[PDB]
Amino acid sequence: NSTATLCLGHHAVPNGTLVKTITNDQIEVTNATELVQSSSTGRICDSPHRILDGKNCTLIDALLGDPHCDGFQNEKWDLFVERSKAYSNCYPYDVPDYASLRSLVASSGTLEFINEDFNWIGVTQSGGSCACKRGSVNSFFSRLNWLHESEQKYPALNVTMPNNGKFDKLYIWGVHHPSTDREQTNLYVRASGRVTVSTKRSQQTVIPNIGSRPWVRGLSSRISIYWTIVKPGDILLINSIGNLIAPRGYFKIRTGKSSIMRSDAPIGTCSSECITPNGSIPNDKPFQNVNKITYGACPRYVKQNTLKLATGMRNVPEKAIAGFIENGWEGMVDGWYGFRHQNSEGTGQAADLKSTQAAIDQINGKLNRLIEKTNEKFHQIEKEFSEVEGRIQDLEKYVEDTKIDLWSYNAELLVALENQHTIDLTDSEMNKLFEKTRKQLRENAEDMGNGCFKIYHKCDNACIGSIRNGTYDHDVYRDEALNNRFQIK
Amino acid sequence: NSTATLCLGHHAVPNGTLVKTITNDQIEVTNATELVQSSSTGRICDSPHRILDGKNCTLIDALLGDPHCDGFQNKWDLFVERSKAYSNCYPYDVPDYASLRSLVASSGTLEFINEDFNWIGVTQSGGSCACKRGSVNSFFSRLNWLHESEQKYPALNVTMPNNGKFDKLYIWGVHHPSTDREQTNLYVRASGRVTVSTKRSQQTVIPNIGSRPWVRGLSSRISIYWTIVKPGDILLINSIGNLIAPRGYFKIRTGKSSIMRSDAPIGTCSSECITPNGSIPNDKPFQNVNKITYGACPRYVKQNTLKLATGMRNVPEKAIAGFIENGWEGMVDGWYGFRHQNSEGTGQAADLKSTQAAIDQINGKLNRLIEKTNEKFHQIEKEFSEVEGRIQDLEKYVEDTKIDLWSYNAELLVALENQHTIDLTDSEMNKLFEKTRKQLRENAEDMGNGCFKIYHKCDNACIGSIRNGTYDHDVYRDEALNNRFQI
Amino acid sequence: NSTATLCLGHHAVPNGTLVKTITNDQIEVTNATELVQSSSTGRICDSPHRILDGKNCTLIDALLGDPHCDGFQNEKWDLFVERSKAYSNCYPYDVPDYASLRSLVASSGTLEFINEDFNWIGVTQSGGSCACKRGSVNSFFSRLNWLHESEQKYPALNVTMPNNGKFDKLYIWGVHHPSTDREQTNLYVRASGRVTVSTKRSQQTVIPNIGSRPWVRGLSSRISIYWTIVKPGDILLINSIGNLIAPRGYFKIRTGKSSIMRSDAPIGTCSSECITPNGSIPNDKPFQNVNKITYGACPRYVKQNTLKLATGMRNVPEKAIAGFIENGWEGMVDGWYGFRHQNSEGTGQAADLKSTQAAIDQINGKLNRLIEKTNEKFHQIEKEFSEVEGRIQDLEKYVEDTKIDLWSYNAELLVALENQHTIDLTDSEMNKLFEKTRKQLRENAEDMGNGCFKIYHKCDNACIGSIRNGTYDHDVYRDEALNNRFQIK
């Protein structure tokens, strides 16, 4: 009757979520957000990166000039997308260190080809084959020049091509491996052919190997592909007594942010900074679980499929009025912290805006820092493999597996530390509001232990409102309160 | 006389341990646990992984068919190579020996299937005195040394299609004679070629004739090569001479198998983690036994010890006194408790709830430190017996980078865990003290040393009500207010 | 008049600095230190590591014996410093796997060469060339032996060199590639040549390739360099039909902490444990941003150029006397925490030494724990590249980029956690001093809410000093204080 009760409390929800800390792996909070991107639209957005769909063409086949890949001449790309349906339909070939050539062309990001006037004296040029038709006529790789004898003669070829410019040149050349000895001599006169391509700083000599190889598109012969980069001021010198597959020029080789990716995802008209073989994914989350192969500004790949970041306080279900001691207020929806009172004029409830904003601001602060930083990668290493290789592939897999486990640990520890700090900061906001009310009341109230104060004087609605507003004057009620406290009963 | 003292305190031990945080590298706690496994039984447990002891045989020698390795014909989870292993057949080398050893070890089987290669016009199964099998000239069991017949060596051209649904691993070789007389007495022609190709690959090797140092009586050598044939693909072997032919193929699989160099004996026990020093337990999150591991293992760090605090901050004990700069070495039945003095004497009782609240949080931190498994199988090599250069430099650098990053994680993790353990145990002491204050209301006063001066007659049943949490302050309020605010 | 005010407070400065935590990326503190070393003297200190300046000589040219590199015979080093001005001035050559040979010689850290008496029967030794002048007369690599025909004969060379010692031997040998067929026969009689160098465990056979290569210092011919290590008990056997560039002995190969570094920084007479291509840097900070290429005891390379570690409390600008509640004391310069009072004899201010030392000791403790040594590296991988290589180079760059991003994250998280703990420990020292004063005053004072106490009795200078010293006896003033508190006004 002659007293009033003022209780301090915090909100609670009927649909909490479980998050993790260092101590507890299952603590319930009022709200949480997902830090692992796990879904993808399924399509590769054509912005902001220049996407080049290879369709039926590998990058190497477009480089060499497979007739069905003619549409890729002089193309440029930020990301070349190789399809699993791609195929070769020209002269059967292999590339020693196929992965390295594919990688350096993918990183260069252009197929800009410049024809140079190589003068091959005494030999027939542009040899054709039935296994490489262009317009239903025998043909060959567009960027290579199959040379063979003329008038039953094959004079030693010795041709120089100096780089008098200011950019590097990429030369693609080959060596022809016949099937039989009659084939070797009908094409190159001599029974053994040498091919030597050298600069001032390097030399490469290849000896053809004659022998029956399994039929591929009707042919038992093969061609081995090689490459050579000529620096400005350096000179390209090509020397051959036979089996030379000559270049028709050079490719402009650049240094850029371009790469290549194996994917069957369709190309879509959208904008997304991050691309995976599953399609583009958003980068609003710090981590992702779609694919370890990424291109562009991406979240970091982790092994966990979900990592829940607490964005509210610990959810304590609700138990006269009572305070926050082992009791949450599911009826308080307009704020995270508030006051419940009971006086002579009834009861009421009001939220505290400052302490509510103080907790939201700290959580929005962790979010802005969790969604920050730079993981924008371009050409990296390969991470899936279709053949068994051994040592080099063992090291490539180990590096990536080591990397993923280290970032999985970082993500796991980061969320647990963030959640514990979120729990502590929200618990401190409740304590700071309780202690601020204690200091206002001075000797006019007593801590009841359950988060409520027993105010030892008649405190009407204007009096309760002054405590909530922070304008409570304890000298006004001190004499009345001291009498109610220290009275004999 | 008319008052009583009630003190809050925590336990203390006479044998504390020193742990580290970020501020203090040497803070004493009541108890600690070791997070780094440093010891090993010394033996490799034969469970749960299928262990294959190589004894005197390397994996490559068992693959090719060294006569003293015949017992390895046709599986393993881990092949254990001994340092006492030796070769006792035809002297040989393997270009990219490490990769072939790796892919066979990863496949985890030596299942060999004979195929009927028909070699027309040549003599098969050539033997040598440097590869005796039963005291007779012999050769690698899985290879077929071909040479001339009737002073003729017609060009070999043999196809072997893969009409099945699994991959085939073919192991073949090329023979390098010592002199020209040897080259022609065996292969007629003065030079030779071996070409093994599929639809997607080709390998051509030219023999090299020349004197090489004597090894088991022979100056000649054999270079070993391999080729994988996919289903639908075709193996084609073309040779002018010096061909060491395969007798079939090895079934190549994709599994969790690996290989390890170790001299540790095999034991009849069960252990998920194997190191070259022997199996180690995986009850701790980190280990310092060996960076080479197989199975579900703790992560390798450089530190030999990392102590995780499992008890509160140890304060030696200095009338009764509270917890302020004072621990209670006499309290053995609990971590926190009450000491009182009234008209009926003194007493001490522990608080079970706060004691369990601190133990549960420490058991909670423990659980989470033995959860996220590190189960690796075939990896990279981490020790090397020859100088190689660029590739070996990268392999060492990768492993050294990894160990330094996990060593930092382990160092930071324990320091953060210990600081939180110190803070949570300090908060349990403060919460019990604040819980007691709220019960006493205006019937007591904080003496500053963790004790309360209770300003009323509080007998044993009254002290017990404070400890149980059923203390009624209205009963003693009038008496207490008279003792507090008296002149 | 009959009362006194005692305020608890902390210091503040007019020149605060901004540090980062997990919540706030911009919190102002009174003092901070830089954890990233970003500057360098620009010179390489010649202590404590033995520095060998290569000047005009690459390590490979000093190994082979380029005449202008004669001053490097039998040299030793902890770090070989290659200058960009280096050049070759002998027979034009190439090294298959040049990077691996350069690496293993650099790691061995010595060029100690021991001449061995190879007996080459029937051939002329020490062939010279105009492209390798030594003292203005035709010469050759000092450590190699160019063999050619004698009396128009080149009998098959078959020479053994057993390792009868207890250390490994490093043999450097070569193969000569002529330009024309007449050159091949004028020097080696036969039209082709084989070179086979083998031990009991390895064999290497090289076939020369005849052909025109671009002119380098007047010559179209080349020499390919190879190496072989012979273990104790093993035997070196050299078999050659022609074109052999023979060794004159072996290099002692060691296992040490030596390495090689490309740098143009000048050598200086100073002492520094850490060396970068930019020069020596101090290792007083845990992280550095000068160069990812390091040698010796170094800070760890990160991407951030600055990381400020808070070394003081949160700086709160100063707003009767008032306490620490939303108020710092810029007038307190002799301590971090202190007392401000007002009694009948005036006002005063005094610092608290114990709480000030308790906060400084914890901060000095964190500083020391950040300089514990785990990064002393020597020979590592290469991290810059002047040519395009592909797969192996991609993996080398990816490994280093993976490493830097992981340590950059560690540094970022470490400083944010350290700063938050420093803020928490400095705030706790302020609260503990306030609660310590509360316990002394008992019922003789009341918490005013702003960090000050209202002392309800006459408390002169000797009485205030007892509270500051910790020897305040509340029983002396209890009766006087109770009458002032619970009086009717």
Ligand SMILES: *[C@@H]1O[C@H](CO)[C@@H](O[C@@H]2O[C@H](CO)[C@@H](O[C@@H]3O[C@H](CO)[C@@H](O)[C@H](O)[C@@H]3O)[C@H](O)[C@H]2NC(C)=O)[C@H](O)[C@H]1NC(C)=O
């Ligand atoms: C060395 O042996 C191989 C394998 O026995 C021989 O290759 C085979 O050559 C025949 C043609 O002479 C190929 O047959 C053709 O097959 C196609 C489609 O299968 C068919 O349309 C043609 O009418 C013809 O039958 C056969 O594919 C091919 N086998 C392989 C695996 O490529 C090779 O000719 C022999 N070489 C010498 C020099 O003896």
Ligand SMILES: *[C@@H]1O[C@H](CO)[C@@H](O[C@@H]2O[C@H](CO)[C@@H](O[C@@H]3O[C@H](CO)[C@@H](O)[C@H](O)[C@@H]3O)[C@H](O)[C@H]2NC(C)=O)[C@H](O)[C@H]1NC(C)=O
């Ligand atoms: C080229 O020179 C090498 C080096 O001398 C010759 O190899 C050597 O060949 C002899 C052949 O009689 C080997 O001798 C044998 O040594 C064993 C082992 O102790 C001994 O028990 C035998 O009774 C015999 O004396 C010698 O070991 C071997 N040395 C090496 C390093 O392999 C080779 O014969 C020469 N070839 C030509 C074409 O000149």
Ligand SMILES: *[C@@H]1O[C@H](CO)[C@@H](O[C@@H]2O[C@H](CO)[C@@H](O[C@@H]3O[C@H](CO)[C@@H](O)[C@H](O)[C@@H]3O)[C@H](O)[C@H]2NC(C)=O)[C@H](O)[C@H]1NC(C)=O
């Ligand atoms: C194959 O073609 C190359 C390219 O023409 C020939 O090499 C060239 O040979 C000439 C004459 O030996 C070199 O000329 C010399 O050039 C220097 C300038 O550095 C000049 O001062 C000399 O007086 C002389 O003119 C020319 O530099 C050289 N070119 C290159 C790129 O190396 C080679 O001779 C041909 N081989 C055959 C077998 O025909």
Ligand SMILES: *[C@@H]1O[C@H](CO)[C@@H](O)[C@H](O)[C@H]1NC(C)=O
């Ligand atoms: C809980 O329910 C409310 C009401 O629809 C909803 O707005 C909120 O996002 C839910 N959140 C969770 C994580 O359950």
Ligand SMILES: *[C@@H]1O[C@H](CO)[C@@H](O)[C@H](O)[C@H]1NC(C)=O
């Ligand atoms: C719940 O948390 C997420 C993460 O911050 C936030 O996006 C959302 O607005 C929050 N919801 C509530 C119910 O206010």
Ligand SMILES: *[C@@H]1O[C@H](CO)[C@@H](O)[C@H](O)[C@H]1NC(C)=O
């Ligand atoms: C790709 O190949 C398919 C099937 O051969 C053909 O229908 C299609 O036109 C090709 N696409 C292009 C762009 O050439």
Ligand SMILES: *[C@@H]1O[C@H](CO)[C@@H](O)[C@H](O)[C@H]1NC(C)=O
């Ligand atoms: C993403 O794609 C890869 C195969 O392209 C697959 O292994 C993975 O499970 C996919 N998952 C999601 C969520 O996209």
Ligand SMILES: *[C@@H]1O[C@H](CO)[C@@H](O)[C@H](O)[C@H]1NC(C)=O
């Ligand atoms: C302290 O001694 C007890 C009793 O012998 C023992 O059980 C306990 O494990 C010891 N603890 C430490 C940290 O030494």
Ligand SMILES: *[C@@H]1O[C@H](CO)[C@@H](O)[C@H](O)[C@H]1NC(C)=O
């Ligand atoms: C290799 O195994 C055989 C067969 O037991 C044995 O006699 C020989 O001495 C072994 N070598 C060892 C065990 O060092």
Ligand SMILES: *[C@@H]1O[C@H](CO)[C@@H](O)[C@H](O)[C@H]1NC(C)=O
């Ligand atoms: C185990 O590993 C190697 C040899 O296996 C060597 O360092 C030592 O003998 C052992 N060290 C440890 C820590 O067990």
Ligand SMILES: *[C@@H]1O[C@H](CO)[C@@H](O)[C@H](O)[C@H]1NC(C)=O
């Ligand atoms: C000390 O800690 C360990 C692990 O937390 C526990 O197994 C052990 O029994 C503890 N000892 C005591 C006396 O608490």
Ligand SMILES: *[C@@H]1O[C@H](CO)[C@@H](O)[C@H](O)[C@H]1NC(C)=O
């Ligand atoms: C602030 O100014 C003083 C006065 O020169 C100086 O000693 C101190 O280092 C400065 N601190 C900061 C953080 O600027």
Ligand SMILES: *[C@@H]1O[C@H](CO)[C@@H](O)[C@H](O)[C@H]1NC(C)=O
């Ligand atoms: C390096 O070569 C240049 C040019 O010939 C010469 O002037 C200089 O003195 C040389 N330096 C040394 C240290 O021999």
Ligand SMILES: *[C@@H]1O[C@H](CO)[C@@H](O)[C@H](O)[C@H]1NC(C)=O
């Ligand atoms: C260190 O050297 C490299 C190469 O000159 C340069 O890119 C980098 O900016 C330099 N940084 C400093 C701080 O000297």
Ligand SMILES: *[C@@H]1O[C@H](CO)[C@@H](O)[C@H](O)[C@H]1NC(C)=O
């Ligand atoms: C500022 O911090 C540094 C690092 O702790 C310390 O050396 C210096 O004494 C501090 N300066 C002041 C004015 O306290």
